[PDB]
Write a protein that binds this ligand. Structure first.
Ligand SMILES: [Cl-]
Length: 101
């Protein structure tokens, strides 16, 4: 019973993603947005404690997506990968869906 993903927020400003995620209770709560500072690139924003961390979604020459090293044919696969491998090199932070209304 296929539903849209609760993590894609399109073109919300960086600050608005911070505003929204700061109200989430659980570390790893996250969203993918379309960067305003680098149009055509995506960004990943993630709740951690009293902070919101931002990551560039990077592309290889073939248009595969990655944060650090492991890359995927889709944002959806990148997201899913990072539900169980940390997005961060300084903390263990695993992507989890927002609590949505
Ligand atoms: Cl890990």
């Amino acid at each position: 019973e296929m539903k849209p993903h609760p993590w894609f927020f399109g073109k919300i400003p960086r600050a608005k993603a911070e505003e929204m995620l700061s109200k989430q209770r659980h570390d790893g709560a996250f969203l993918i947005r379309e960067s305003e500072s680098a149009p055509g690139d995506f960004s990943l924003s993630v709740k951690f404690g009293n902070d919101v961390q931002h990551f560039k979604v990077l592309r290889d020459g073939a248009g595969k997506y990655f944060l650090w090293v492991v890359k995927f044919n889709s944002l959806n696969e990148l997201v899913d990968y990072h539900r169980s491998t940390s997005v961060s090199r300084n903390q263990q932070i695993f992507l989890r869906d927002i609590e949505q209304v």
